[PDB]
């Protein structure tokens, strides 16, 4: 399939990593949460459940890498509980990126994510989101589970793929 060859050009250590560097220069200027027209990696999107119907949207999110933005305590602590450096959010940056996308698009449900790039200050992810109220999605037989109100806003309760991994499941 052509999807097998998409993953080969974007694989590991390649001349393609000269093309991808040029994109990053543009991506650093666009807003931190943007809707994009088409997935950058169709192999990753189609495996996670993206289709070419209307109601599927693609969002790119950039976050800031590093550890937790943790302040030094100001009241009295034992020496164990006074340390700052080395802490990272037990939630992954992949799960943090999905959460910020679900804030800006409150009518869509997160289906998956994968990252696309990385530089010295940010990490970039792309999130697959679907509109559960469009009549095209409402009639789909493979997403009939998405008509249950318990299956909405799952990203906030750790029920996505990135959340299951981080819960030790």
């Amino acid at each position: 399939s052509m999807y097998h060859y998409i993953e080969q050009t974007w694989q590991n250590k390649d001349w393609r990593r000269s093309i991808l560097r040029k994109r990053l220069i543009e991506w650093r200027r666009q807003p931190a949460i943007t809707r994009i027209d088409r997935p950058t990696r169709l192999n990753r999107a189609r495996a996670l459940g993206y289709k070419a119907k209307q109601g599927f949207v693609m969002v790119r999110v950039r976050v800031r890498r590093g550890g937790l933005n943790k302040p030094r305590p100001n009241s009295g602590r034992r020496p164990k509980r006074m340390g700052v450096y080395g802490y990272g959010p037990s939630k992954g940056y992949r799960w943090i990126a999905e959460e910020r996308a679900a804030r800006k698009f409150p009518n869509l449900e997160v289906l998956g994510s994968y990252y696309v790039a990385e530089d010295g200050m940010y990490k970039y992810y792309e999130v697959i989101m679907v509109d559960y109220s469009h009549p095209v999605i409402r009639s789909d037989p493979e997403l009939k589970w998405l008509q249950d109100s318990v299956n909405r806003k799952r990203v906030f309760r750790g029920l996505t793929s990135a959340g299951q991994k981080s819960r030790g499941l």
Binding site: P79, K80, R81, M82, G83
Partner: protein, 92 residues
């Protein structure tokens, strides 16, 4: 105190009195990967105070001098109880 280099005592392997060569005891290297050194390093990761007690007050000035005797026929070694002295002058 002076002690000879060679002493004739009982070799329990040979079951008789044989010649022995005399030396003073000296310890080895601490050998990281000892179980109590693996545990100490596992305890020093993270945040906290000084983890373990460390001696500060010292009273003794000498140390117990131990003699090591090696049986010159079979290399069997007997280690003797120590005794508080200044420095055992082992020269013959």
């Amino acid at each position: 105190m002076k002690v000879p280099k060679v002493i004739k005592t009982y070799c329990p392997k040979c079951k008789t009195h044989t010649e022995h060569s005399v030396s003073l005891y000296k310890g080895g290297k601490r050998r990281s990967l000892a179980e109590g050194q693996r545990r100490y390093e596992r305890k020093n990761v993270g945040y906290g105070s000084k983890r373990k007690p460390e001696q500060k007050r010292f009273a003794k000035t000498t140390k117990k001098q131990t003699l090591v005797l090696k049986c010159q026929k079979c290399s069997y070694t007997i280690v003797k109880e120590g005794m508080r002295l200044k420095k055992l002058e082992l020269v013959e």
